[PDB]
Structure prediction request, 529 residues.
Amino acid sequence: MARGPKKHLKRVAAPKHWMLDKLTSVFAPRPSTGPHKLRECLPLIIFLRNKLKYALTGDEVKKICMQRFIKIDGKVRADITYPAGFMDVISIDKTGENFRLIYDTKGRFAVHRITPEEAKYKLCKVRKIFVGTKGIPHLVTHDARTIRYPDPLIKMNDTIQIDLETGKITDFIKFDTGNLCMVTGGANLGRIGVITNRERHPGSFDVVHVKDANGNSFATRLSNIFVIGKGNKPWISLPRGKGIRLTIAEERDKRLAAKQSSG
Amino acid sequence: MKLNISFPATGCQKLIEVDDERKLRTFYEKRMATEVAADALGEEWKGYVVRISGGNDKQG
Amino acid sequence: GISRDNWHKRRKTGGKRKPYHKKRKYELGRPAANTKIGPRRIHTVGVRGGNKKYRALRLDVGNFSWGSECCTRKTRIIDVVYNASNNELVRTKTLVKNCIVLIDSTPYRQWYESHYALPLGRKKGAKLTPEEEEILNKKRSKKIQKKYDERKKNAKISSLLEEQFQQGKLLACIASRPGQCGRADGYVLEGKELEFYLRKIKARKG
RNA sequence: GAAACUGCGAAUGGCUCAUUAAAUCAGUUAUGGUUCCUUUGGUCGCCUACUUGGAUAACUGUGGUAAUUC
RNA sequence: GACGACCCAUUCGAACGUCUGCCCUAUCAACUUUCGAUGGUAGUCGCCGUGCCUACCAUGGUGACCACGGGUGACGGGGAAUCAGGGUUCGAUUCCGGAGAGGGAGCCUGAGAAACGGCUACCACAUCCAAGGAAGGCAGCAGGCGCGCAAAUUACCCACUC
RNA sequence: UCGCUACUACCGAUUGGAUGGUUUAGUGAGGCCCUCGGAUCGGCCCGCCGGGGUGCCCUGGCGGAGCGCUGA
Prediction:
């Protein structure tokens, strides 16, 4: 087919962490270009009728977004699709609600409601340091913000708190052993645990061991690690589950113990 | 042939039909945008000069 | 049309591969510049992704440099002498990267005379005395000597250099692609290169 | 508010399996060898300026060709 | 607020390149080279790397571990049928990648095309004509002829999905 | 072995015919590039009038000369 870029993505080509069905038609939404990557996005309209169920058809979302009740990262967006991903804040001010996009231990974007006070900032990883013209530095982040004049000891794989109102980061975390980390990709996903150890290989695909407070050791690639706060002390709010990563046997035991499927 | 005489100071233009060889001999063997005296065209022209701006061959 | 494909041409074993995909726009030729020396004719060529590419035909000026004392001035490009890729290109006066050409040699002397306070090779001192001595002698009080003293014994200028000024020509090396850049540029020969290419010139012609 | 100039899309999709045996393709790797509409974030002061120059369409009117989105 | 523009970063990619993996055939055993085959040096071209191309110079490269040549009712993969274990057979075909729009070649526009619901020419077809000329490409959905053992409605509609 | 019918393959004169693909040489449409070419259309200078200003200037309208210089 191709001679230039494509503009469709089907249902069955689309990722499985949007939790799509198979008895609505061939196409799926496809996020338009933005700061996040499409195997890490949650498109906007999938949050509004395949999670929260305010809307019921795509035409309803087109009538909602135009009214400008929606924000994303403290700015106003007004389209059916926007590629919000890990560590962004949605803000509906009419309902007085604020969400956060973060991973379940299952490895899918959950509903993590939060105070409006918490929703005035987000946590951003540094990925690249690049000296611009005339002796000025830059940062580059995964949410694709270029923040000039950072403190001169902040380096890649650190994380920085950004004030959505004014940009211009107030504080930061430094990447060190024994600090608390979250996983953002790979086979292990959504697990929370301290760093414990590092491993280096000259070349590529260095790995990073992890250990949790349930006494389990696991490892993952370097570039799927994200820092959340100092040892056993997140600088963010955490959802239920909390990176335990239960076996399937124990999950069965909980459900038949509470006998929970009715209220 | 025909002609389409045009007066560009009213924006009006009219047709006339001739087949007299002599009057048309003034136009023959000359390229577009040449001017020639239209005094040959009759006795109702006596200080007129025209410019030919082109036209249409047979078969359009 | 004329193409720069890679799905033609035999593999290592002498094998052939049968025709696969039809020619495409990102594998493409477009005939050679074949730039000469003459009055400036430049053509602007649209190229892939935008970002227009200048093709220069018949240049006559390039920005050479004398990096020994670090001055670079705009000078005329007279004629070709040596082309280290082919012999035929010299005969039709084609100008490409790493040629050896001739220049006027004029501003380099003007710069030297004003800065180091000495002329180069000269036919006669008679010319200098009414005018061109006006610069060389100076009326400063105070900084007739004071400036010039620091310039002294940093101007030994080498033997192979000095003899060339008298002819009014100097041998410089094209260090640009004129057909891609739209400009001729280069550096002037010094040292062992300048000894080398003389021997090639005298070997090949004459 | 028809028409017309301008911007954008028409390189996506749909369809077929003819060509094609280290080719296609799959897993794995590489741009420190390159290009990139668009989105997102930064980049934004070395007798004319109270705003410069002159033509084309629609439109009006006259036509040609057996015939054309002429 | 809206629009536009230069550069950097980002996103969607695009393009080349690495290592490993292939059906039948020797009644195909030597193959490749100035009509560049392999390498060196310089240059041209191209978005870039590169014998891609040109000049000069060297004589290499490949093969019984099956090259080279020929054949394939051979598009490739994710898969499908059968099945104790090991296998055998199939994969045009809803997802992904590729190639092509009657057969060949060339080219315009654009960020992206060697595009065919763009263009120009040749070749094979076929249409209109006042014979001066003009116009065309259903391997898009329906539908017709032909071919055969062999395959549907010239229907309704943008409400869903995009 | 020889004789009788159905049926299959092989050799074969005809230097068989038909269709398709390779190959030397010659010829070569069309486009692109390059080198020329200049149909044709404007601009700025000198007369008369209008406006502004100091026979003259600028700009506009109108005509003619060299069409001089210049662009497309």
User: Anything to note?
Assistant: Residues 31-33 of chain B lie near RNA strand F (CB under 10 Å from a C1'). Residues 21-25 of chain B form the longest helix (5 residues). Strands of chain B lie at 2-7, 12-17, 35-37, 49-51. Chains B and C do not touch (no CB pair under 8 Å).
